[PDB]
Amino acid sequence: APVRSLNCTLRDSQQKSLVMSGPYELKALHLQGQDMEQQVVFSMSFVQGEESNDKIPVALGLKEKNLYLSCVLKDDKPTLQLESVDPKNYPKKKMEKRFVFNKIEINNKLEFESAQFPNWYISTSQAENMPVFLGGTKGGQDITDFTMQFVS
Secondary structure, eight states: OOOEEEEEEEEETTOOEEEESSSSOEEEEOOOGGGGGGSOOEEEEEOSSOOBTTEEEEEEEETTSSEEEEEEEETTEEEEEEEEOOTTTOSOSSOOGGGOEEEEEETTEEEEEESSSTTOEEEBOSSTTEEOEEESOSSSSSBOOEEEEEOO
């Protein structure tokens, strides 16, 4: 049938919210009160891919925008980008692999691993107002843990 999707927000484990940084990047910062309206709302689609109890393949589109997070090589490195798509054709259940993330639940937090690039994760910096990026580890000083908030 039609792919199933949920509206949501994400925050990193330092409770940094995600906002637009120009047209094709996200950044993470501490937001509270009226300024929280700047945060991006996702449509999380539940897509085709290898799946287990705590590891669920998803796509992350911007709500009612033909823009998806994707993982591609840029200057020979795995990178995170926002990518435009044909709005007639998306979302779909069989999303291309660059758009797929494995949503992993570990100790009440979520990680989003690239399905294309094993052990590369959606990441934020500890510093304020820096890009959301794809990082090659769930170790280190960058943040790879998130929580989701459900949106009407």
